[PDB]
Amino acid sequence: LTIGNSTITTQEAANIIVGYGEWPSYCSDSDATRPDVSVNRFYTLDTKLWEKSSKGWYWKFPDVLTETGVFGQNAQFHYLYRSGFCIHVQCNASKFHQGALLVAVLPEYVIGTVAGGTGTEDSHPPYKQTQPGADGFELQHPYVLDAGIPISQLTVCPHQWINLRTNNCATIIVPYINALPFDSALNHCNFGLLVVPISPLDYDQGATPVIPITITLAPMCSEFAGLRQ
Amino acid sequence: SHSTAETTLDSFFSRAGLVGEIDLPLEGTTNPNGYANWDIDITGYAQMRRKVELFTYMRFDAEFTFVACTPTGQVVPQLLQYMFVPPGAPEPDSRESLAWQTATNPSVFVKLSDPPAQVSVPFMSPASAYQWFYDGYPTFGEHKQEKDLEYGACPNNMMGTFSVRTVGTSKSKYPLVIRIYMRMKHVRAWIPRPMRNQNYLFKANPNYAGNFIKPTGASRTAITT
Amino acid sequence: SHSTAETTLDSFFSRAGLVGEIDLPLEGTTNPNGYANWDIDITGYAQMRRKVELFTYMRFDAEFTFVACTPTGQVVPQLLQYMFVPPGAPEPDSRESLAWQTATNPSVFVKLSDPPAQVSVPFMSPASAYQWFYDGYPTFGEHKQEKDLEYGACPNNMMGTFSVRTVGTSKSKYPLVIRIYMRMKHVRAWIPRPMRNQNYLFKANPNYAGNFIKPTGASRTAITT
Amino acid sequence: VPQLLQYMFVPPGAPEPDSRESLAWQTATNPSVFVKLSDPPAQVSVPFMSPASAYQWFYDGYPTFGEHKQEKDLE
Amino acid sequence: GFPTELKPGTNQFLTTDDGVSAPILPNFHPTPCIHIPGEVRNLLELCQVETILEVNNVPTNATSLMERLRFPVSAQAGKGELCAVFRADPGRSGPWQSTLLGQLCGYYTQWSGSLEVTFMFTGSFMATGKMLIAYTPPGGPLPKDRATAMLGTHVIWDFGLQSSVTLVIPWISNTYTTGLVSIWYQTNYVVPIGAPNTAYIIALAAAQKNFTMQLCKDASDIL
Amino acid sequence: GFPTELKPGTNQFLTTDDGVSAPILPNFHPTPCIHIPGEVRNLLELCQVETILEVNNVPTNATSLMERLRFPVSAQAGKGELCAVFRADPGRSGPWQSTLLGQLCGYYTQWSGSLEVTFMFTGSFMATGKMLIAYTPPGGPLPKDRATAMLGTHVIWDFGLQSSVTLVIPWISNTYTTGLVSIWYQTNYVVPIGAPNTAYIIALAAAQKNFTMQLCKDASDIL
Amino acid sequence: GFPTELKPGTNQFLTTDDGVSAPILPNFHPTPCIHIPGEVRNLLELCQVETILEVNNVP
């Protein structure tokens, strides 16, 4: 893609999947400024440690981007925000590497904490358990994903499978999907990113024990809108 | 059958299933004031909850019937009227509360010989679809310095409640048992969710037990069939 | 809902609200003669009065229902007939008065198993619109030298009254409770008046108390929100 | 007598109720009608829902669809 | 004589039922409705009429109930702040319920819309100055200072032009509870020698086309 | 006023009856349903979605529940037999009930159809070999040996071609209860020096057009 | 709401009555009847078939 000073090469001979094949539409109800010069540069999320004992990572959107990045600082001005997400997952392995990673996006993924004892009596999640920042937290038991959701039923939603054999990278376009076009920004959780490997990483001794996995995102439809309050 | 019209969604889902029995004995502690209020809870009964948990967002019309009888199955000549209180109007607290005077509800005069009346209410929820668990902050401000008890609370999501009471100044001399049958007519699927495999422990929270189980372990070995 | 037809004036105003209970006990002092007369008063009940006081002149049709039951909510096999006396005919005073013989009113033979009958009366008022307080002099002469008691009086504005009595020579052996539900169907606005803010003290006069109050004083200071 | 009665049919798929509080009484597929004994008995109709195309009370053959003929074939 | 089984809900009595029965007088007919000049077919036209609002509900004693209707402006204040208009909630108690629109919305549950507050200037003839109106988006708190109000959406109001005020939305987002509009003293009220140093201002509110209700329910708190 | 004798079944109450009554709110109308991008009109399209299957349900303790999702392949086995896929019965307990299709069919009684089981190869890059799939007709028992499986219907699967697998019926007759599909080790998994000797394989099943149910009945075993 | 006096014979039960009621399964439809070679529409054709007669019923 060549727009301005940006010059990158990607593979256009992959399986590009779009959710239900429908771009977001604009609302026309009555119930009630797009800078893309220094904001359109591609952002690379910090690399995760893909390792044999790695259990997976989860991220709440756009909760983790409310303040952390440039998206955070220019969302600190506008009360509302809505844009498309460019999923960018790539596999970098040699002829001696094995594995199979499953990546999916689940709208309205509810988080569940731990609650032991005979009597059901739960408290409210604290600040760090609700948003741990960029540090993240490794799933203790991904077989039901630390939330009572077993892996066997994650396929019911639009999904795709990652086989590192033929692809070198995968790009997924998920449109701005929501039940209410006018909704809160810092309150409602639109969706979350779950990366659950199926085949654990396998390699003989001598190779690099960690594979650098890259996550990149770009605003497909930058629209802050809203009003100053 | 041979025709595929019999095997459609209307006949698949059209089935009046029991939702609960209203206990109004001659004497008791639960409702000694001669009336009771029953909130409409779909998650209360397991099987209908398991049916509705396959989906999240949907659109249907509601029709209610009040089947009342004695524990012996006989009828008595007593005057009864079924009146629904809107959510906007507060629930009646005393026998002489002004909530009994809602003019918006028409009244029908019948006798127990007449089979139970049929009442229908449309989808009057303020939102476009049902949502029993609210993810997010109901407060629409920056207040996050105090104890946020609103997490999971929704003081706006009540659909109302029913008010069945003994009409008349004199106390009823007969014990009664009330049964209610529900079924969904117009079903549409908007946002699919995985159908629950692990049993729920509480109805107002998605919390689970610390000791998970396996759906089935009949297969001792993969070799044997 | 999505259609605007559900949110129209017909559904906004169509609501059968309680107007009063007719007390006809087995023994008592109010009506020991076995019958009673209830004048139709819209100003008697506060909420319907507060509803109708938004306007002055209007045009609607009236439909009446008589729901009768025992204080225990049971029915008894007793013969009852609902008969309305026109204003022209005088109200019956004795049990054997000739006012019971009005031929203009048809009769229907039913039993308590049949739900209560429905009776409708059109707008038969001599004037074109309702007027509960009469400003002016009913006398159409120059007489202003005596004590004019007619100020506010209107011997022509009665709309009639209902006559519910126990049919038969033998006295009824059961206590009864009667309830009546009212709602307006055809509403039109002709002369608007301000909607009342200060509570009335009497129903037949617009008089008020000498100690006026404030609708609300929650806001302690204008600065605080 | 003034007693409340309801006629409910259990499908073959659903098991027959064994106890007074069995969950088989909770079949949602069957609508309910509220009447009194003054009303004459209700009329209920069921179509031909048998898995086969026609009735067969005596079954000639082996229900087992295998080669097992070495044991006591009670089927 | 015709076959029919007793269907459920024949003798059922409904609170909201609308039925027709034979008139009590099949021979006496009501008089026809004659034409009268005063004529209204929908009360909604009366519903969106302009209404006055009583701001100074600070006093409560009977000895000061006379000046509730109007509020004064003082020249002693310099670069300060007169008053913050309360949140546009016709349901919540306060000055809103005293209004006809508030009494209207008191029988309903939900209400969503964008509100405009118009001010007409009633200073002295030789009085001059600039007064500034600014709106705050919902969610955000009250602006701390006049500079804080200025750094957001701002509208210039001149004393020679009365009705140029218009509703401009701050921003739209894609997702206390609601925001409020506030007024701040840009320039203190100044008059020369021989002119009075105080005046009175009148506040009025109206209803827009986008103001609607979906559900009706009978709920009166008073009395 | 019209002649009619009381026909049987007027006041009869039916469990499956579908009737309409007057709405409780004849004046409050529900809001219209607005357009949302996510849209499904029939849940059947979701019903024939692909589903993963959990084969290794051999363990039962909580200390080994993590590796249930995937199963390994070992090179130690030579010309042997990995596993026999269980009979395609969505109703019978086991791996079938864990599937979404099995949970779907758990509310029904009968099901007849022909099933295909697809496998995608996930060995090492330099790994080579031939793996063989064979189906057994119903009634006939499990094949005794790899030769016994070969003498029936047989399908050649190459590791370089992924989706060529298709459903071929063994034979049709004119008349245990149902047959099963089994996999046998034609060639042991071989890798050269420096490559790992183990790998993982994934099994997935889907629904065909000929999959239908005729009768609906409310029957839940859990809970 | 419509005038009708109770006519005789409404709730009457008849031995030979032929009526129709709502099906118990409004959503489960019976399978269509497939074509089979053996087909008879009237049993009368079977009724006038030839029959043997047993004369010697003396023993």
Per residue, the 3-state secondary structure of chain E, as one string, reads: CCCCCCCCCCCCECCCCCCCCCECCCCCCCCCCCCCCCCECCCHHHHCCCEECCCCCCCCCHHHCHHHCCEEEECCCCCCCCCECCCCCCCCCCHHHHCHHHHHHCCCCCCCCCCCCEEECCCCCCCECEEEEEECCCCCCCCCCHHHHHCCCCEEEECCCCCCCCCCCCCCCCCCCCCCEEEECCCCCECCCCCCCEEEEEEEECCCCCCCCCCCCCCCCCC
Q: Cite the DSSP H helix spans in chain B.
A: 9-13, 46-52
Q: Name the closest residue on chain F to residue B197, using Cα atoms.
A: F98
Integer distance in angstroms from the first to the last C-alpha of chain D? 47
Under a CB-based contact definition with an 8 Å cutoff, are residues B211 and F62 in contact?
yes
Alpha carbon distance F87, F182 (integer Å): 10
E strand or H helix that includes residue F71:
strand F71-74
> Pairing relation of β-strands F71-74 and B62-65?
unpaired
- Shortest CA distance to G25 belongs to which of E110, F109, A25, F49? F109
Task: Name the token pair of F11.
Answer: 């006041």
Q: Shortest Cα distance from E49 to chain C (angstroms)?
A: 12
Alpha carbon distance A56, A194 (integer Å): 7
Q: What is the separation of C-alpha C130 from the centre of its chain, rounded to a whole number of angstroms?
A: 13
- Amino acid making up residue E104: L
Alpha carbon distance B49, A59 (integer Å): 29
Residues of F with Cβ-Cβ distance to G27 under 8 angstroms: 216
Burial class (CB in 10 A: 0-12, 13-18, 19+), D47: middle
For residue F72, what are the contacts with CB-CB under 8 A and spacing of at least 6?
A: F198, F199, F200
- Amino acid making up residue D39: D
Contact B117 E217 (CB under 8 A): no
- Amino acid making up residue B118: Q
Residues of F with Cβ-Cβ distance to D27 under 8 angstroms: 15, 218
Which of F21, F26, F31 is the closest to E18 by Cβ?
A: F26
Physical contact, A and D (3 or more Cβ pairs within 8 A): no
- Shortest CA distance to E188 belongs to which of E139, E143, E144, E127? E127
Alpha carbon distance A12, A1 (integer Å): 11
Q: Name the closest residue on chain B to residue E215, using Cα atoms.
A: B124
Which of G21, G27, G34 is the closest to D45 by Cβ?
A: G21
| Residues in chain G, total | 59
Alpha carbon distance A91, A50 (integer Å): 11
Under a CB-based contact definition with an 8 Å cutoff, are residues E160 and A168 in contact?
no
- Shortest CA distance to C8 belongs to which of E111, F26, E17, E14? F26
Alpha carbon distance F9, F3 (integer Å): 18
Determination technique for this PDB entry? cryo-EM
Number of A to F CB contacts under 8 A, please give it: 74
Residues of B with Cβ-Cβ distance to C177 under 8 angstroms: 167-170
Q: What is the separation of C-alpha C101 from the centre of its chain, rounded to a whole number of angstroms?
A: 24
- Shortest CA distance to A76 belongs to which of B42, E171, F55, E75? E171
Count how many Cα atoms sit within 13 Å of the Cα of residue E102 in the half-sphere of its side chain.
22
- Shortest CA distance to B60 belongs to which of B112, B104, B115, B121? B121
B161 has which bridge partners?
Answer: B39, B85
Which 8-state DSSP code applies to residue F67?
Answer: G
Q: If DSSP codes are grouped into helix, strand and coil, which group holds residue F40? A: strand
For residue A131, what are the contacts with CB-CB under 8 A and spacing of at least 6?
A: A60, A63, A64
Q: What is the separation of C-alpha A183 from the centre of its chain, rounded to a whole number of angstroms?
A: 20
> Pairing relation of β-strands F118-120 and F198-205?
antiparallel
A212 has which bridge partners?
Answer: A49
Alpha carbon distance G37, E180 (integer Å): 83
E73 has which bridge partners?
Answer: E199
Q: Name the closest residue on chain F to residue D9, using Cα atoms.
A: F15
Task: Give CA separation, B180 vs B68, B107, B116, B165, D43, in Å.
Answer: 9, 20, 11, 16, 21
Other CB atoms closer than 10 Å to residue B85's CB: what's the count? Answer: 20
Q: Name the closest residue on chain G to residue D38, using Cα atoms.
A: G11
With left for phi above 0 and alpha for psi between -120 and 50, is residue F94 left, alpha or beta?
A: left
Q: If DSSP codes are grouped into helix, strand and coil, which group holds residue F79? A: coil
Helix count (H) and strand count (E) of chain F? Answer: 4, 7
Residues of F with Cβ-Cβ distance to C10 under 8 angstroms: 26-27
E strands in chain A = 2-3, 6-7, 43-50, 57-61, 85-90, 98-107, 159-161, 169-174, 191-202, 211-217
Under a CB-based contact definition with an 8 Å cutoff, are residues E36 and C58 in contact?
no
Task: Name the token pair of A85.
Answer: 């997400």
With left for phi above 0 and alpha for psi between -120 and 50, is residue B152 left, alpha or beta?
A: left
Alpha carbon distance B1, A211 (integer Å): 59
Under a CB-based contact definition with an 8 Å cutoff, are residues F190 and F129 in contact?
yes
Under a CB-based contact definition with an 8 Å cutoff, are residues F189 and F73 in contact?
yes
Residues 56-95 of C with CB under 8 A from B: 65-76
Angle at C207 between CA C195 and CA C180, to 5 degrees: 65
- Amino acid making up residue B179: R
Task: Name the token pair of E140.
Answer: 């955000």
State the resolution, in angstroms.
7.1
A43 has which bridge partners?
Answer: A217
Residue that is written with structure tokens 């003989």 in the block: A204
Alpha carbon distance A147, A144 (integer Å): 6
Side-by-side strand order, sheet with C176-182: C17-24, C176-182, C67-69
- Amino acid making up residue A125: P
Contact E5 D40 (CB under 8 A): yes
Other CB atoms closer than 10 Å to residue E85's CB: what's the count? Answer: 20
Which of A100, A143, A200 is the closest to F65 by Cβ?
A: A143
Q: If DSSP codes are grouped into helix, strand and coil, which group holds residue A152? A: helix
Other CB atoms closer than 10 Å to residue B88's CB: what's the count? Answer: 17
Alpha carbon distance E177, E87 (integer Å): 10
For residue D69, what are the contacts with CB-CB under 8 A and spacing of at least 6?
A: none
- Shortest CA distance to C181 belongs to which of B52, A7, B107? B107
- Shortest CA distance to D51 belongs to which of F23, B217, G31? G31
